[PDB]
Amino acid sequence: ELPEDPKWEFPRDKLTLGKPLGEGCFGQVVMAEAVGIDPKEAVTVAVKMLKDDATEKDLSDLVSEMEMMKMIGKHKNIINLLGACTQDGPLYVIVEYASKGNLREYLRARRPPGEEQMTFKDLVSCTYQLARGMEYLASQKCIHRDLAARNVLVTENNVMKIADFGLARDINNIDYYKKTTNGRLPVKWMAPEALFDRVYTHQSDVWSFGVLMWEIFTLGGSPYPGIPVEELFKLLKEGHRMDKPANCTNELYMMMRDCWHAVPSQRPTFKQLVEDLDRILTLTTN
Amino acid sequence: LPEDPKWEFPRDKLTLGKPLGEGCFGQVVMAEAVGIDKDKPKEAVTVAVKMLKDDATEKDLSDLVSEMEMMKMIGKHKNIINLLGACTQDGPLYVIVEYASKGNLREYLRARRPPPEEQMTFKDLVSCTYQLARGMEYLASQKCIHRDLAARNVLVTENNVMKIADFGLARDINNIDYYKKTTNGRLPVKWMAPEALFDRVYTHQSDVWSFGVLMWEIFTLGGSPYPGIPVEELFKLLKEGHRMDKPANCTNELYMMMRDCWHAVPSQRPTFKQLVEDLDRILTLTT
C-alpha cells in the first residue's frame, strides 16, 4: 500500500519501542531506541504510529505528515524527521525526541509556587527560538497552521521545537475560497482571514504566533478565557483582543497586538519578529 | 443558529458539573437540569451535556450541530441515549442528553473481569447483547445508520441498562455520499464492514457487521478486536476470509451469530430484527 523511500526507510529490527509519550488522543507516540539511525550507536527517538481504533483518514493524515516533514530541512527549532518503517507492518514515523514534553504543560509546571520558575529572559528566549523556527519554516514555503503551545516540544536542554505538522501544508497546497478550507484549525489560534476569506498565508501563521506568545507569557494560560469559540469571531471583528499578561512588558504586548492586526500585510513578518525579539533578548541580558 | 422551541432549554436552569469521559473529541460534563422533565417543572434532573472543547475547530461545531439534529430525528427508546434539550442561543452550544451513571460498556466490562466489581454471568452478557440488538433494530426502523458501533460507544445506566450512544457519525440512510472517495473515511477500521471501504457504501447490514465486533467485545469482557493486527494490514486479511476466533466464555451458537454478522456478503448477514429474535430465544432458555 505504501511506496518505499530508500533515503528515509529504517529497519524495524533496528528499532526498539519504549514507553508511550503524551496523552495519546489523536495517535500513538512512543519513545524508542534507534540503532544506527544517526552509525552503530543507539539514538533515543520518538515514533508516531496509529492507535488501535484509528480511521482510514488517520492513516492518510499520518502519511501526509511524514511527507510534509520530508520537505522540511533540518533546523534547531523544529522537530525533524529521522526516518520511517513503511514496509510490511504498521507505519512508524520516526522523529526527534524532546524529553521535557509540550510547552503548554512545561510552562504550567513552573508557575509561581503560590520546578525552577521561568525567568523573564527565559520567556523571551522561548519566544525568540520559536520565531526563528517559524522564520525558517516560512522560508521553506511551509505554513504550519496549527501553532500553539501544545504543538511545541522542549528538549532536555530547553531548546524550543515546533511540532505536529499534521495540518501543515506547502504554500501552494491550499484551496483558496473553498468553503471547507481551514475547517480543521483550532479556532482560538486562527487568523480571521482563514475563515472569512478561506485563504492561508505566512501572515496567517504570525497571527497564531501572537496567541502562542500570549500563552507563553501567561505561563500556559488558555486564550480568550470565558469566551466560547462559537462567539469568538464576532468579537474579533469588533476589535476585541486579549489583555496584556501580568508581568508582561508593554513592548512585548504591543508585539502580540501587531500579530493580531486585522490586515495580514500589516502584521509583522517572522523575520521582523526574530529581529525585535533578538534585540529585547540582548537588552535583558545586559 | 436557528430557533427550535421544542428543544430549547434555558441556560439558567442548568448547572454544569464535573467532566465525564476522557474528553478527546469533545467536552461532556455531568449536570443538573431543573425542569427538563416538563411534568416536574421544579425538579432537578441529572443529565449529560455535550459542548465544544476550548480548542475546537469550525468542523467540530458543525459536527456537534449535526449530531444534535440527528438525535432530534431519533425517537425515544429504552436502549438509546436520547436527546433531552439544547441551549443554542446567546452562548456556547449545549446538547443535553440522558446521563448514564456507569460509563461506557468497554470499561464497564473490563472492570468486571476476574482477577462495581461483581463478575458478569453468561446470562448478563446475553442480556447485554439483546438490549443492544433491540436498540439497533429500532434505530434501523428509524432509517438511521450509526456507523460507529463499538463498546466504547455504549453507556450503561445505574440499573445496568445498555444504551447506544455517540451519534456523531450517524446518518439517515438516504444521506450518504455513495461511491465518493471520502465516504466512511472517519470510521474506526476495526469495526468497519469491508464494503464501507471497498465500495464506499453504508447500509444497515454494515451496522450488523459492527454489531458483530461489538458482540466479540462483550464476550471477551472488553477485549481489543483483532489483537496484534495493525489497522494497516487488517482489510487484506479480511478479504482472505480471516475472522476473529471464538471468545473463551462464549457458546458456539453465539459465535456462529458473530460469524453471520461478519458474512462477506452484506445481504447474507442477518438483520437486527432477526438478531433480536434469536437473542430473545437464547436469553429465554438461559433465564
Coordinates of C-alpha atoms in Angstrom, one line a residue:
Chain A
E1 CA 0.0 0.0 0.0
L2 CA 2.9 2.3 0.7
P3 CA 5.9 3.0 -1.7
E4 CA 9.4 2.7 -0.2
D5 CA 11.6 5.7 0.1
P6 CA 15.2 4.5 0.4
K7 CA 16.6 7.8 1.7
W8 CA 14.2 7.6 4.7
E9 CA 13.4 3.9 5.3
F10 CA 14.6 2.5 8.6
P11 CA 14.9 -1.2 9.5
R12 CA 12.3 -2.3 12.1
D13 CA 14.7 -4.8 13.6
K14 CA 16.9 -1.8 14.3
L15 CA 14.2 -0.1 16.3
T16 CA 13.2 -0.9 20.0
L17 CA 9.8 0.6 21.1
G18 CA 9.7 2.1 24.6
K19 CA 7.1 3.7 26.8
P20 CA 4.3 6.0 25.4
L21 CA 4.7 9.7 25.1
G22 CA 1.7 12.1 25.6
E23 CA -2.0 11.7 26.3
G24 CA -2.5 9.7 23.1
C25 CA -5.9 11.1 22.0
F26 CA -5.1 11.6 18.3
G27 CA -2.4 9.0 17.7
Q28 CA 0.1 6.7 19.4
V29 CA 3.6 8.1 20.1
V30 CA 6.3 6.1 21.9
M31 CA 9.8 6.7 23.0
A32 CA 12.3 4.3 21.3
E33 CA 15.9 3.4 20.6
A34 CA 17.0 3.6 17.0
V35 CA 20.3 1.8 16.3
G36 CA 22.4 3.4 13.5
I37 CA 19.7 5.9 12.5
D38 CA 22.5 8.5 13.1
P39 CA 26.4 4.5 12.5
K40 CA 26.2 1.7 15.0
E41 CA 25.1 3.7 18.0
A42 CA 21.6 3.8 19.5
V43 CA 19.6 7.1 19.5
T44 CA 16.6 7.9 21.6
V45 CA 13.8 8.9 19.2
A46 CA 10.0 9.3 19.1
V47 CA 7.8 7.2 16.9
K48 CA 4.4 8.2 15.6
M49 CA 2.0 5.3 14.7
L50 CA -1.7 4.6 14.5
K51 CA -3.9 3.9 17.5
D52 CA -5.9 0.7 17.7
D53 CA -9.2 2.4 16.7
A54 CA -7.7 4.6 14.0
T55 CA -9.7 5.5 10.9
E56 CA -8.6 5.5 7.2
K57 CA -8.3 9.3 7.4
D58 CA -5.9 8.9 10.4
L59 CA -3.7 6.8 8.2
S60 CA -3.6 9.1 5.2
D61 CA -3.2 12.0 7.7
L62 CA -0.1 10.4 9.2
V63 CA 1.3 9.6 5.8
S64 CA 0.8 13.3 4.8
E65 CA 2.5 14.5 8.0
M66 CA 5.5 12.3 7.1
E67 CA 5.7 13.6 3.5
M68 CA 5.5 17.2 4.7
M69 CA 8.3 16.7 7.2
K70 CA 10.4 15.2 4.4
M71 CA 10.2 18.6 2.7
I72 CA 11.5 20.4 5.8
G73 CA 15.2 20.8 6.1
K74 CA 17.0 20.3 9.4
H75 CA 16.6 23.1 11.9
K76 CA 17.4 23.6 15.5
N77 CA 13.9 24.8 16.5
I78 CA 11.9 22.2 14.6
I79 CA 11.1 18.5 15.4
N80 CA 12.7 16.9 12.4
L81 CA 12.1 13.6 10.6
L82 CA 14.7 10.9 11.2
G83 CA 13.2 8.0 9.2
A84 CA 10.3 5.7 8.8
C85 CA 9.3 2.0 8.7
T86 CA 6.8 1.8 5.8
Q87 CA 7.0 -1.8 4.6
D88 CA 5.3 -5.0 5.8
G89 CA 4.0 -3.7 9.1
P90 CA 2.4 -0.7 10.8
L91 CA 3.6 2.7 9.6
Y92 CA 6.2 4.1 12.0
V93 CA 7.2 7.7 11.6
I94 CA 10.4 8.4 13.5
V95 CA 11.1 12.0 14.6
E96 CA 13.4 13.8 17.0
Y97 CA 12.8 13.3 20.8
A98 CA 12.2 16.1 23.3
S99 CA 12.4 14.9 26.9
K100 CA 10.6 17.8 28.5
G101 CA 7.3 17.4 26.7
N102 CA 5.0 20.1 25.2
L103 CA 5.5 23.7 26.1
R104 CA 2.0 24.2 27.5
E105 CA 2.5 21.8 30.3
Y106 CA 6.1 22.8 30.6
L107 CA 5.0 26.4 31.2
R108 CA 2.3 25.4 33.6
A109 CA 4.6 23.2 35.7
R110 CA 6.9 26.1 36.7
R111 CA 4.3 28.7 37.6
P112 CA 4.9 30.6 40.8
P113 CA 4.6 28.2 43.8
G114 CA 1.8 30.4 45.1
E115 CA 10.4 23.2 39.5
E116 CA 12.5 26.3 38.9
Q117 CA 10.4 29.3 37.9
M118 CA 10.7 30.7 34.4
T119 CA 12.7 33.9 34.3
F120 CA 11.5 36.8 32.2
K121 CA 14.6 36.2 30.0
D122 CA 13.6 32.5 29.6
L123 CA 10.2 33.6 28.3
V124 CA 11.8 36.0 25.8
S125 CA 14.3 33.3 24.7
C126 CA 11.5 30.8 24.3
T127 CA 9.6 33.2 22.1
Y128 CA 12.7 34.1 20.2
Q129 CA 13.5 30.4 19.5
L130 CA 10.1 29.7 18.1
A131 CA 10.2 32.8 16.0
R132 CA 13.4 31.6 14.4
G133 CA 11.8 28.2 13.9
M134 CA 8.9 29.8 12.1
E135 CA 11.1 32.2 10.0
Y136 CA 12.8 29.1 8.7
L137 CA 9.5 27.3 8.1
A138 CA 8.2 30.3 6.1
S139 CA 11.4 30.4 4.1
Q140 CA 10.6 26.8 3.2
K141 CA 7.2 27.6 1.7
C142 CA 5.6 25.9 4.6
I143 CA 2.5 27.1 6.6
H144 CA 2.1 25.3 9.9
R145 CA -1.5 26.4 10.5
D146 CA -1.6 24.8 14.0
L147 CA 0.7 26.9 16.0
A148 CA 0.1 26.6 19.8
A149 CA 1.9 25.9 23.0
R150 CA 0.5 22.3 22.8
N151 CA 2.4 21.9 19.5
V152 CA 5.8 22.9 20.8
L153 CA 8.1 20.5 22.5
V154 CA 11.0 21.1 24.9
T155 CA 14.3 19.2 24.9
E156 CA 16.4 18.2 27.9
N157 CA 18.4 21.4 27.4
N158 CA 15.3 23.6 27.0
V159 CA 15.5 24.0 23.2
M160 CA 12.1 25.0 21.8
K161 CA 11.0 22.9 18.8
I162 CA 7.8 23.3 16.7
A163 CA 6.0 20.0 16.3
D164 CA 2.8 18.4 14.9
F165 CA 2.8 19.1 11.2
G166 CA -0.4 17.2 10.7
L167 CA -2.1 20.4 9.5
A168 CA 1.0 21.9 7.9
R169 CA 1.0 22.5 4.1
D170 CA 3.2 23.6 1.3
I171 CA 2.2 27.2 0.4
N172 CA 0.5 26.0 -2.8
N173 CA -1.4 23.1 -1.3
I174 CA -4.4 25.2 -0.1
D175 CA -7.7 25.6 -2.0
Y176 CA -8.4 29.3 -1.8
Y177 CA -12.1 30.2 -1.4
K178 CA -13.3 26.6 -0.9
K179 CA -15.9 26.5 1.9
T180 CA -14.1 23.6 3.5
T181 CA -10.7 25.2 3.7
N182 CA -9.2 25.7 7.2
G183 CA -12.2 23.9 8.7
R184 CA -10.0 21.8 10.9
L185 CA -7.9 24.5 12.5
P186 CA -8.4 25.3 16.2
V187 CA -10.5 28.5 16.3
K188 CA -8.8 30.3 19.1
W189 CA -5.4 30.3 17.4
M190 CA -6.8 31.0 13.9
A191 CA -6.4 34.2 11.9
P192 CA -9.8 35.7 10.8
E193 CA -9.0 35.7 7.1
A194 CA -8.5 31.9 7.4
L195 CA -12.2 31.6 8.0
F196 CA -13.8 34.7 6.3
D197 CA -11.8 34.5 3.1
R198 CA -10.8 30.9 3.1
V199 CA -7.1 31.5 2.4
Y200 CA -3.9 30.9 4.4
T201 CA -0.5 32.7 4.1
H202 CA 2.6 33.0 6.3
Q203 CA 1.0 36.1 7.8
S204 CA -1.8 33.8 9.0
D205 CA 0.8 31.9 11.0
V206 CA 2.1 35.1 12.6
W207 CA -1.4 35.7 13.9
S208 CA -1.2 32.3 15.5
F209 CA 2.3 33.2 16.7
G210 CA 0.6 36.0 18.6
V211 CA -1.7 33.7 20.6
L212 CA 1.3 31.4 21.2
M213 CA 3.1 34.4 22.7
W214 CA 0.2 35.2 24.9
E215 CA 0.2 31.6 26.1
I216 CA 3.9 31.8 26.8
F217 CA 3.8 35.0 28.9
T218 CA 0.7 33.8 30.8
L219 CA 2.8 30.7 31.6
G220 CA 0.4 28.3 29.9
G221 CA -2.8 30.3 30.1
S222 CA -5.8 29.4 27.9
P223 CA -6.6 32.1 25.3
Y224 CA -9.7 34.2 25.5
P225 CA -10.8 32.7 28.9
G226 CA -14.5 32.6 29.4
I227 CA -15.2 33.1 25.7
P228 CA -16.6 30.1 23.7
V229 CA -15.4 29.5 20.2
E230 CA -18.9 30.0 18.7
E231 CA -18.7 33.6 19.8
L232 CA -15.1 34.5 19.2
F233 CA -15.1 35.8 15.7
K234 CA -17.9 38.3 16.1
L235 CA -15.9 39.8 18.9
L236 CA -12.6 39.9 17.0
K237 CA -14.4 41.6 14.1
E238 CA -15.5 44.2 16.7
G239 CA -11.8 44.8 17.5
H240 CA -11.6 42.6 20.6
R241 CA -8.1 41.3 21.6
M242 CA -6.7 39.6 24.7
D243 CA -5.3 41.7 27.5
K244 CA -1.7 42.1 28.4
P245 CA -0.4 39.2 30.5
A246 CA 0.6 40.0 34.1
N247 CA 4.3 40.9 34.4
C248 CA 4.5 41.3 30.6
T249 CA 6.2 44.4 29.3
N250 CA 4.1 46.8 27.2
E251 CA 6.6 46.3 24.4
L252 CA 6.0 42.6 24.2
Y253 CA 2.2 43.1 24.5
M254 CA 2.3 45.6 21.5
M255 CA 4.2 42.8 19.6
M256 CA 1.3 40.4 20.3
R257 CA -1.1 43.2 19.2
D258 CA 0.7 43.7 15.9
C259 CA 0.4 40.0 15.2
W260 CA -3.3 40.3 15.7
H261 CA -3.7 43.1 13.1
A262 CA -6.9 42.7 11.1
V263 CA -4.9 43.2 7.9
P264 CA -2.4 40.3 7.3
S265 CA 0.2 42.5 5.5
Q266 CA 0.2 45.0 8.4
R267 CA 1.2 42.2 10.8
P268 CA 5.0 41.7 11.2
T269 CA 6.8 39.0 9.3
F270 CA 8.6 36.3 11.1
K271 CA 11.9 37.9 10.1
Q272 CA 10.9 41.2 11.8
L273 CA 9.8 39.3 14.9
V274 CA 13.1 37.5 15.1
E275 CA 14.9 40.8 14.9
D276 CA 12.8 42.5 17.5
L277 CA 13.0 39.5 19.9
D278 CA 16.8 39.3 19.5
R279 CA 17.0 42.9 20.5
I280 CA 14.8 42.5 23.6
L281 CA 16.7 39.4 24.5
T282 CA 20.0 41.1 24.3
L283 CA 18.8 44.1 26.3
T284 CA 17.6 41.9 29.2
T285 CA 21.0 40.1 29.3
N286 CA 22.6 43.5 29.6
Chain B
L1 CA -28.1 29.1 14.9
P2 CA -31.8 28.5 14.1
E3 CA -34.5 28.6 16.8
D4 CA -36.1 25.3 17.6
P5 CA -38.6 25.9 20.5
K6 CA -39.4 22.2 21.1
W7 CA -35.9 21.5 22.3
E8 CA -34.6 24.8 23.5
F9 CA -33.8 24.7 27.2
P10 CA -33.0 27.8 29.4
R11 CA -29.3 28.2 30.3
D12 CA -30.2 29.4 33.8
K13 CA -32.0 26.2 34.6
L14 CA -28.8 24.2 34.0
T15 CA -25.8 23.8 36.4
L16 CA -22.7 22.2 34.8
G17 CA -20.9 19.8 36.9
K18 CA -17.7 17.6 36.8
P19 CA -16.3 16.3 33.5
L20 CA -17.5 13.0 32.0
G21 CA -15.4 10.7 29.8
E22 CA -11.8 11.3 28.6
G23 CA -12.6 14.4 26.6
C24 CA -10.6 13.8 23.4
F25 CA -13.0 14.8 20.6
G26 CA -15.4 16.9 22.7
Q27 CA -16.4 18.1 26.2
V28 CA -19.1 16.3 28.1
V29 CA -19.9 17.1 31.6
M30 CA -22.4 16.0 34.2
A31 CA -25.2 18.5 35.1
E32 CA -28.4 19.3 36.9
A33 CA -31.3 20.4 34.8
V34 CA -34.2 21.9 36.6
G35 CA -37.5 21.1 34.9
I36 CA -36.0 19.3 31.9
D37 CA -38.9 16.9 32.5
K38 CA -41.9 19.2 31.8
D39 CA -44.1 17.2 34.2
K40 CA -41.8 18.2 37.1
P41 CA -41.1 22.0 36.5
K42 CA -39.2 22.4 39.8
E43 CA -37.3 19.1 39.8
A44 CA -33.6 18.9 39.0
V45 CA -32.6 16.0 36.7
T46 CA -29.1 14.8 36.4
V47 CA -28.2 15.0 32.7
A48 CA -25.1 14.8 30.4
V49 CA -24.1 17.9 28.4
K50 CA -22.0 17.9 25.2
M51 CA -20.2 21.1 24.2
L52 CA -17.1 22.2 22.4
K53 CA -13.6 21.9 23.9
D54 CA -11.5 25.1 24.4
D55 CA -9.6 24.3 21.2
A56 CA -12.5 23.2 19.0
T57 CA -12.4 23.7 15.2
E58 CA -15.1 25.0 13.0
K59 CA -15.8 21.4 11.9
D60 CA -16.2 20.4 15.5
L61 CA -19.0 22.9 15.8
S62 CA -20.9 21.8 12.6
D63 CA -20.5 18.2 13.7
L64 CA -22.0 18.9 17.1
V65 CA -24.8 20.7 15.4
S66 CA -25.4 17.7 13.0
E67 CA -25.2 15.3 15.9
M68 CA -27.9 17.3 17.7
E69 CA -30.1 17.3 14.6
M70 CA -29.8 13.5 14.2
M71 CA -30.7 13.0 17.8
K72 CA -33.9 15.0 17.2
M73 CA -34.8 12.6 14.5
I74 CA -34.4 9.5 16.6
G75 CA -37.4 8.6 18.6
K76 CA -37.2 7.9 22.3
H77 CA -36.0 4.3 23.1
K78 CA -35.1 2.5 26.2
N79 CA -31.7 1.3 24.8
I80 CA -30.6 4.5 23.2
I81 CA -29.1 7.7 24.6
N82 CA -31.9 10.2 23.9
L83 CA -31.8 14.0 23.4
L84 CA -33.4 16.0 26.2
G85 CA -32.7 19.6 25.2
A86 CA -30.3 22.1 23.8
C87 CA -29.0 25.6 24.6
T88 CA -28.5 27.2 21.2
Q89 CA -28.9 31.0 21.6
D90 CA -26.6 33.6 23.0
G91 CA -23.8 31.4 24.2
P92 CA -21.9 28.1 23.7
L93 CA -23.9 25.3 22.2
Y94 CA -25.0 22.7 24.7
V95 CA -26.5 19.4 23.7
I96 CA -28.4 18.0 26.6
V97 CA -28.7 14.2 26.6
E98 CA -29.5 11.4 29.0
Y99 CA -27.0 10.6 31.8
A100 CA -25.6 7.1 32.3
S101 CA -24.0 6.8 35.7
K102 CA -21.8 3.8 35.0
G103 CA -19.9 4.9 31.9
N104 CA -19.1 3.2 28.6
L105 CA -19.5 -0.6 28.2
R106 CA -15.9 -1.3 27.4
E107 CA -14.5 0.0 30.6
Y108 CA -17.6 -1.4 32.4
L109 CA -16.8 -4.9 31.2
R110 CA -13.0 -4.7 31.8
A111 CA -13.8 -3.6 35.3
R112 CA -15.9 -6.8 36.0
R113 CA -13.1 -9.2 34.9
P114 CA -12.0 -11.8 37.3
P115 CA -8.5 -11.2 39.0
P116 CA -18.7 -2.3 41.0
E117 CA -16.6 -5.4 40.6
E118 CA -19.1 -8.3 40.7
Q119 CA -18.3 -10.7 37.8
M120 CA -20.7 -10.9 34.8
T121 CA -22.7 -14.1 34.3
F122 CA -23.4 -15.6 30.9
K123 CA -27.0 -14.5 31.2
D124 CA -25.7 -11.0 31.9
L125 CA -23.6 -11.0 28.7
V126 CA -26.5 -12.3 26.6
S127 CA -28.9 -9.8 28.2
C128 CA -26.5 -7.0 27.4
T129 CA -26.2 -8.2 23.8
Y130 CA -30.0 -8.4 23.5
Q131 CA -30.6 -4.9 24.8
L132 CA -28.2 -3.5 22.2
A133 CA -29.7 -5.6 19.4
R134 CA -33.1 -4.0 20.2
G135 CA -31.6 -0.5 20.1
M136 CA -30.2 -1.1 16.7
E137 CA -33.4 -2.7 15.5
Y138 CA -35.3 0.4 16.5
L139 CA -32.5 2.6 15.0
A140 CA -32.8 0.8 11.7
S141 CA -36.6 1.2 11.8
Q142 CA -35.9 5.0 12.0
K143 CA -33.9 4.9 8.8
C144 CA -30.7 5.6 10.8
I145 CA -27.3 4.0 10.4
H146 CA -25.0 4.5 13.4
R147 CA -21.7 3.7 11.6
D148 CA -19.6 3.8 14.8
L149 CA -21.0 0.9 16.8
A150 CA -18.5 -0.2 19.5
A151 CA -18.4 -0.9 23.2
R152 CA -16.8 2.5 23.9
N153 CA -19.9 4.0 22.3
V154 CA -22.4 2.1 24.6
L155 CA -23.2 3.5 28.0
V156 CA -24.8 1.7 31.0
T157 CA -27.3 3.3 33.4
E158 CA -27.3 3.0 37.2
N159 CA -29.6 0.0 36.7
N160 CA -27.3 -1.6 34.2
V161 CA -29.4 -0.7 31.2
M162 CA -27.4 -0.7 27.9
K163 CA -27.7 2.4 25.8
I164 CA -26.3 3.1 22.3
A165 CA -24.6 6.5 22.3
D166 CA -22.4 8.9 20.4
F167 CA -24.3 9.7 17.2
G168 CA -21.6 11.9 15.8
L169 CA -21.2 9.8 12.7
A170 CA -24.8 8.6 12.4
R171 CA -26.6 9.4 9.2
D172 CA -30.1 9.0 7.8
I173 CA -29.9 6.1 5.2
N174 CA -30.6 8.5 2.3
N175 CA -27.9 11.0 3.5
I176 CA -24.7 9.1 2.4
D177 CA -22.5 10.1 -0.5
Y178 CA -22.2 6.7 -2.1
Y179 CA -19.0 5.9 -4.1
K180 CA -17.3 9.1 -3.1
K181 CA -13.6 8.6 -2.2
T182 CA -14.1 10.4 1.1
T183 CA -17.1 8.3 2.3
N184 CA -16.6 6.3 5.5
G185 CA -13.1 7.8 5.9
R186 CA -13.7 8.7 9.6
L187 CA -14.8 5.3 10.8
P188 CA -12.7 3.2 13.1
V189 CA -11.5 0.4 10.8
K190 CA -11.5 -2.5 13.2
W191 CA -15.3 -2.1 13.5
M192 CA -15.9 -1.3 9.8
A193 CA -17.7 -3.5 7.3
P194 CA -15.4 -4.3 4.3
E195 CA -17.9 -2.8 1.8
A196 CA -17.8 0.6 3.6
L197 CA -14.2 0.9 2.4
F198 CA -14.1 -1.1 -0.8
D199 CA -17.4 0.3 -2.2
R200 CA -17.9 3.4 -0.2
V201 CA -21.5 2.5 0.7
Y202 CA -23.1 2.0 4.1
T203 CA -26.3 0.2 4.8
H204 CA -27.9 -1.3 7.9
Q205 CA -26.1 -4.5 7.1
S206 CA -22.9 -2.6 7.6
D207 CA -24.0 -1.9 11.1
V208 CA -24.7 -5.6 11.8
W209 CA -21.1 -6.2 10.9
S210 CA -20.1 -3.7 13.5
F211 CA -22.6 -5.3 15.9
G212 CA -20.7 -8.5 15.4
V213 CA -17.5 -6.9 16.6
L214 CA -19.4 -5.3 19.4
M215 CA -20.5 -8.8 20.3
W216 CA -17.0 -10.1 20.3
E217 CA -16.0 -7.2 22.6
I218 CA -18.8 -8.1 25.0
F219 CA -18.0 -11.8 25.3
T220 CA -14.3 -11.0 25.7
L221 CA -15.2 -8.7 28.6
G222 CA -13.8 -5.6 26.9
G223 CA -11.2 -7.3 24.7
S224 CA -9.4 -5.4 21.9
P225 CA -10.6 -6.6 18.5
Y226 CA -8.1 -8.2 16.1
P227 CA -5.4 -8.3 18.8
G228 CA -1.9 -7.8 17.4
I229 CA -3.2 -6.9 13.9
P230 CA -2.4 -3.3 12.9
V231 CA -5.2 -1.5 11.0
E232 CA -2.8 -1.0 8.1
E233 CA -3.0 -4.7 7.3
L234 CA -6.4 -5.7 8.5
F235 CA -8.5 -5.3 5.4
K236 CA -6.2 -7.6 3.4
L237 CA -6.7 -10.3 6.0
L238 CA -10.5 -9.7 5.9
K239 CA -10.6 -10.2 2.1
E240 CA -8.9 -13.5 2.7
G241 CA -11.7 -14.5 4.9
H242 CA -9.9 -14.0 8.2
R243 CA -12.2 -13.6 11.2
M244 CA -11.7 -13.4 15.0
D245 CA -11.6 -16.6 17.0
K246 CA -14.3 -17.6 19.5
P247 CA -14.1 -15.9 22.9
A248 CA -13.3 -18.5 25.6
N249 CA -16.6 -17.8 27.5
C250 CA -18.9 -17.7 24.5
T251 CA -21.1 -20.5 23.3
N252 CA -20.8 -22.0 19.8
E253 CA -24.2 -20.7 19.0
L254 CA -23.4 -17.1 19.9
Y255 CA -20.2 -17.3 18.0
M256 CA -22.0 -18.5 14.9
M257 CA -24.1 -15.4 15.3
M258 CA -21.0 -13.3 15.4
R259 CA -19.7 -15.0 12.2
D260 CA -23.0 -14.4 10.4
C261 CA -22.7 -10.8 11.3
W262 CA -19.3 -10.9 9.6
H263 CA -20.5 -12.6 6.4
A264 CA -18.7 -11.3 3.4
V265 CA -21.9 -10.6 1.6
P266 CA -23.9 -7.8 3.2
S267 CA -27.3 -9.2 2.3
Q268 CA -26.3 -12.6 3.6
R269 CA -25.7 -11.2 7.1
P270 CA -28.8 -11.2 9.4
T271 CA -30.9 -8.2 10.1
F272 CA -31.3 -6.6 13.5
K273 CA -34.9 -7.9 13.5
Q274 CA -33.6 -11.4 13.3
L275 CA -30.8 -10.9 15.8
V276 CA -33.4 -9.7 18.3
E277 CA -35.5 -12.8 17.7
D278 CA -32.6 -15.3 18.1
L279 CA -31.1 -13.5 21.0
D280 CA -34.5 -13.4 22.6
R281 CA -34.8 -17.1 22.1
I282 CA -31.4 -17.8 23.6
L283 CA -31.9 -15.4 26.5
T284 CA -35.2 -17.1 27.4
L285 CA -33.8 -20.6 27.6
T286 CA -30.9 -19.4 29.7
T287 CA -33.2 -17.4 32.0

